[PDB]
RNA sequence: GUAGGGGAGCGUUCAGUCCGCGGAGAAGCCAUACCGGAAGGAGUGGUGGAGCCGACUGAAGUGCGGAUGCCGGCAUGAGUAACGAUAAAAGAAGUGAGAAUCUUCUUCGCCGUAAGGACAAGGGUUCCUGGGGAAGGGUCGUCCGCCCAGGGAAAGUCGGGACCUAAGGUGAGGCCGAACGGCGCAGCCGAUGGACAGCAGGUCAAGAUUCCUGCACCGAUCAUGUGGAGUGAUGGAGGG
RNA sequence: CGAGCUGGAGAUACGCUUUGACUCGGGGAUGUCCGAAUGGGGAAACCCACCUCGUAAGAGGUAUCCGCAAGGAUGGGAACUCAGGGAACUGAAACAUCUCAGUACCUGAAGGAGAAGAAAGAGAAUUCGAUUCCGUUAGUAGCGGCGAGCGAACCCGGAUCAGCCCAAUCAAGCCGAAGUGGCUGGAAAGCUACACCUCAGAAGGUGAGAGUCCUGUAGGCGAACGAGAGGUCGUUGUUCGUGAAACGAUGACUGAAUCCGCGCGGACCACCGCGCAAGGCUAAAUACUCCCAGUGACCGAUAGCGCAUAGUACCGUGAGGGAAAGGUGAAAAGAACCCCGGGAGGGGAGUGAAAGAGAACCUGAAACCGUGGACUUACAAGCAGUCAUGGCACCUUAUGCG
């Protein structure tokens, strides 16, 4: 049957993207929080 | 439903069970010609002899 | 400058056969405009070009031990000149 | 050479020395990519020279406007 | 945790100096410094000497082939010698010229 | 003698001090019929290859069989179930260290509005060539969508952009709100739509309305001629 | 500094360096694209422009807010600071005031600190004199469904001291004492015989444990650059829960005196005392610890950070979650060459002190899987032990208590 994850480049970028995350204080707060954890993958646009 | 064993089977048991897995070694005969060995009523796999000479080399 | 733009020549059965019909093939800087490439080849070889085509080429992703990585993305440029003009340093080849 | 040889000449001579160095580096890239490139070192050496040139003409152009 | 760390990456002798082997199997044998590596604290002296094996590689030559070459040693089994004493000797830094630093013993100098 | 109270001790790390061992071999590990009232403790021998015992004193992350406890390794079930559509296989030949499984030939069988062909989304080198065979393949593999190397993708005309607007998202000014912020006209972003110039063939081992051949087309800039007075926007109308 | 160097990387080749390399210290030049991003757009790291110079190559500029200008701002920063907003579980052995708690969290602004500060004060001696912080007062005085529970301040002793103006030496580095012989051992530091320096016996490295072998320590030297008002309603703050409720604090309404005047002293009045609101800045003691150095009756591979490094692999659309990982040898001398095998693996040889260290390399317990040997078992009812005896076997705490 049709499963949850149904890949869509533009979806992913527009939703979990760097521009997206920067558009809001809470997403900015993710960015900083992640940087802090030392993630290789700051954000989806890093893939 | 769904049977399952009640108790681990001892190493002793398990091995008593296995008292019958002895392979049976071939009864082996020596070819009357080229001389290695063969199975009764089969072609001698060294030369190819079964009285004259059937399989190839 | 000019010379910076032309990274290397393309070496492969294909490319040789191409130059044998007077058509040459260069590994270029990924950002290069086709006009930039055209001009660059002209200056570097004093050759008039009548036709170019290019192509960005994703670098092969390979692995060394546990380390997975990508090679540099490149760009291939194919040029064809007029007058059966040839380029010596790469014609004998 | 790094110090002497550079400063003594004109900023219009630099452009030329640069250009020629660029060109040799490219020749060495074609060679290397085709093989063998008997003398690798020369590459790096030429690189250095380029640097020197651009450093000098920078330095000088700002020391003549001191 | 490199070998030079303990000895401040510093060699207590130069390349080309003669050296007496203080410690080990080659006690006292003597030789010219053919190679000295500061950071690793390893030094070559025409006396240690081993038999190494070149295994498969068809260069040099298809077959194997064995070889006699010296194997470097740890700085701390090396010393400058003193032409008089002829033996294992410490070093003092004194002066000459004309801005040259030099090396003496209890009776300069090498 | 259970909960519980009391008493004397055993062993463990670390710490101070004393004694003192140790390459003619420490700790740890292994065997053992000896010792002590018990925790426990020595003797000898085997292992090991660089640290450590005894005594007194001090401080604890200090003693395990349980907690459907936690991490880890290995057993049982057991050579058991299963090997993933009942569309189906046979021989020859080749290769190879090894073949029911790979390659070729001849047939056989199964799909045929599909189980054939072409796009999109997605994937990302999986394509082609040459090699490889540990693991991945539910067997086997000499094979592969696996592993290694090198090649391969070409656009004025196809799709997107340098044009357009829809929902929607934005949005100087402007309207509200403890803060971060919520709205918001024009403008702007936004294809799933409007607009818009190239067809027929050929061929790499791997590209093709891109490359090559054959003949068209489009805008733009300039030159020569036809010029011989109009050009027509950021607003109007038609139209789309 | 003075001989090596060519990064972890250990690998071949090219080569650089006493005309001073490499490394260390100190300044500059260059510094693509994204990110406050800031020319415009954008699904970050990509697409599209305009202007001035320029021969082109190229260079520079093109955001918003304060300002005339100059110049300033935007963003980031683990904790620490202040401010706007502000939980519940829970405790009250139920719960609603209360408590958790002005804690968590959210937002803001800022610094290396910050806050606070120069008495319309605390207070009761007609005493003290800016603030913060520590001790103490003190679980006192008080608060409280007067239940649970909450909880000051003054004094005294310390840390650090400060009050002014306006409106009519450390950061590279260099110098730096003193031992040899024999013995064990593969190897000397250990043993042994005599010997020396110590302002230096802190420490690490050297084939095992080295004051006197190397690096160092005590001590000395050391740079061009480098661094030092009142009121009423509604509420609330401190011990302050409407209590007799003073005082500050504002949201609403309202609104006086200026020196014989004004504000306080816990309703309220007189008296007696302390005080000059409505105007601003202020270092020092204090907090924290991303980073750096020293130390440890802290840990040494399930411990210690999640990591002997990784926020990786891996899981998740995302927010987010998140591992295991260590050890040849003193030194690679990393096993030429021979044997079986396609290989894998192994047996030799050779190296090594040891391959009883061979790269699935320190020790290598237990579970668990096997080979071999002793005594044993195919008429047997069993928590598998325990006692007694007989048989066989064996003799290193062992010919007996076995
Ligand atoms: Mg293209
Ligand atoms: Mg691959
Ligand atoms: Mg009793
Ligand atoms: Mg002790
Ligand atoms: Mg211990
Ligand atoms: Mg257990
Ligand atoms: Mg269960
Ligand atoms: Mg388990
Ligand atoms: Mg069976
Ligand atoms: Mg069964
Ligand atoms: Mg069955
Ligand atoms: Mg079956
Ligand atoms: Mg199947
Ligand atoms: Mg079947
Ligand atoms: Mg054959
Ligand atoms: Mg089949
Ligand atoms: Mg055939
Ligand atoms: Mg199909
Ligand atoms: Mg692609
Ligand atoms: Mg298989
Ligand atoms: Mg083959
Ligand atoms: Mg393929
Ligand atoms: Mg065409
Ligand atoms: Mg909006
Ligand atoms: Mg469309
Ligand atoms: Mg069209
Ligand atoms: Mg189009
Ligand atoms: Mg040096
Ligand atoms: Mg921008
Ligand atoms: Mg509740
Ligand atoms: Mg309760
Ligand atoms: Mg900030
Ligand atoms: Mg009130
Ligand atoms: Mg209150
Ligand atoms: Mg009041
Ligand atoms: Mg361990
Ligand atoms: Mg082998
Ligand atoms: Mg047996
Ligand atoms: Mg009977
Ligand atoms: Mg019987």
Short mmCIF file of C-alpha atoms (C1' of nucleotides) in Angstrom, two decimals, chain E residues 3 6-8 10-15 22-25 27 36-39 41-42 50-56 62-66 71-72 74 76-78 88 90-93 101, chain G residues 2-6 18 22-23 173-181 184-188 204-207 210 212-216 330-337 349-353:
data_model
loop_
_atom_site.label_atom_id
_atom_site.label_comp_id
_atom_site.label_asym_id
_atom_site.label_seq_id
_atom_site.Cartn_x
_atom_site.Cartn_y
_atom_site.Cartn_z
CA UNK E 3 59.09 10.19 20.22
CA UNK E 6 60.02 14.03 25.19
CA UNK E 7 63.17 15.47 23.70
CA UNK E 8 61.61 18.71 22.47
CA UNK E 10 65.76 18.37 19.43
CA UNK E 11 68.76 16.49 18.17
CA UNK E 12 71.79 16.40 20.45
CA UNK E 13 73.97 15.85 17.40
CA UNK E 14 74.13 16.88 13.76
CA UNK E 15 74.19 14.90 10.53
CA UNK E 22 76.09 4.01 24.07
CA UNK E 23 73.44 1.35 24.80
CA UNK E 24 72.38 -2.02 23.46
CA UNK E 25 73.84 -4.72 21.24
CA UNK E 27 77.83 -0.98 22.43
CA UNK E 36 69.03 11.99 11.46
CA UNK E 37 65.33 12.64 12.02
CA UNK E 38 64.63 15.09 14.85
CA UNK E 39 60.88 14.65 15.39
CA UNK E 41 64.50 10.88 17.18
CA UNK E 42 65.95 8.28 14.86
CA UNK E 50 70.11 -5.69 9.09
CA UNK E 51 69.07 -8.10 6.39
CA UNK E 52 65.79 -6.91 4.78
CA UNK E 53 63.65 -8.78 2.25
CA UNK E 54 62.21 -7.29 -0.97
CA UNK E 55 59.33 -9.84 -1.30
CA UNK E 56 57.36 -10.38 -4.60
CA UNK E 62 60.59 -10.50 -10.71
CA UNK E 63 62.07 -12.81 -8.03
CA UNK E 64 62.42 -11.66 -4.46
CA UNK E 65 65.99 -10.93 -3.43
CA UNK E 66 67.37 -10.12 0.00
CA UNK E 71 68.36 0.16 10.46
CA UNK E 72 68.04 3.51 12.20
CA UNK E 74 66.85 5.94 18.79
CA UNK E 76 69.31 8.19 23.07
CA UNK E 77 71.81 5.47 22.01
CA UNK E 78 74.01 7.99 20.25
CA UNK E 88 81.20 8.62 25.18
CA UNK E 90 78.90 15.14 27.00
CA UNK E 91 78.80 18.56 25.35
CA UNK E 92 79.24 22.18 26.39
CA UNK E 93 78.21 25.11 24.22
CA UNK E 101 78.49 28.38 18.51
"C1'" G G 2 70.65 26.49 12.79
"C1'" A G 3 70.00 21.42 9.55
"C1'" G G 4 67.07 19.47 7.90
"C1'" C G 5 62.66 19.56 5.03
"C1'" U G 6 58.75 18.00 1.13
"C1'" U G 18 73.90 27.36 5.48
"C1'" C G 22 61.49 23.54 7.93
"C1'" U G 23 59.39 24.83 12.65
"C1'" G G 173 64.02 31.49 22.55
"C1'" C G 174 69.19 30.78 24.47
"C1'" C G 175 72.83 29.24 28.54
"C1'" G G 176 72.79 25.73 31.82
"C1'" A G 177 76.74 20.87 37.28
"C1'" A G 178 78.26 15.81 37.84
"C1'" G G 179 80.64 8.36 36.22
"C1'" U G 180 83.27 4.73 34.96
"C1'" G G 181 84.84 -0.57 35.42
"C1'" U G 184 73.21 -11.13 35.25
"C1'" G G 185 70.49 -10.38 30.99
"C1'" G G 186 68.27 -10.36 24.23
"C1'" A G 187 68.96 -5.74 26.06
"C1'" A G 188 71.32 -1.98 31.90
"C1'" G G 204 59.41 12.43 30.93
"C1'" G G 205 62.32 9.48 26.95
"C1'" U G 206 66.49 5.65 26.65
"C1'" G G 207 65.93 -2.60 24.72
"C1'" A G 210 69.42 6.20 35.16
"C1'" U G 212 75.88 12.52 37.00
"C1'" C G 213 73.31 9.09 28.66
"C1'" C G 214 69.20 12.72 26.07
"C1'" U G 215 65.27 16.46 27.16
"C1'" G G 216 65.02 19.03 31.34
"C1'" A G 330 62.90 -2.38 22.16
"C1'" A G 331 63.29 -1.65 17.05
"C1'" A G 332 59.56 -3.44 10.94
"C1'" A G 333 64.37 -6.15 11.25
"C1'" G G 334 56.36 -6.69 8.67
"C1'" A G 335 58.67 -13.11 7.20
"C1'" A G 336 63.18 -13.18 0.74
"C1'" C G 337 62.82 -18.30 -0.68
"C1'" A G 349 63.02 -21.51 6.51
"C1'" G G 350 64.94 -16.69 7.83
"C1'" U G 351 64.53 -12.46 11.45
"C1'" G G 352 63.61 -11.79 16.83
"C1'" A G 353 65.32 -12.87 23.39
#
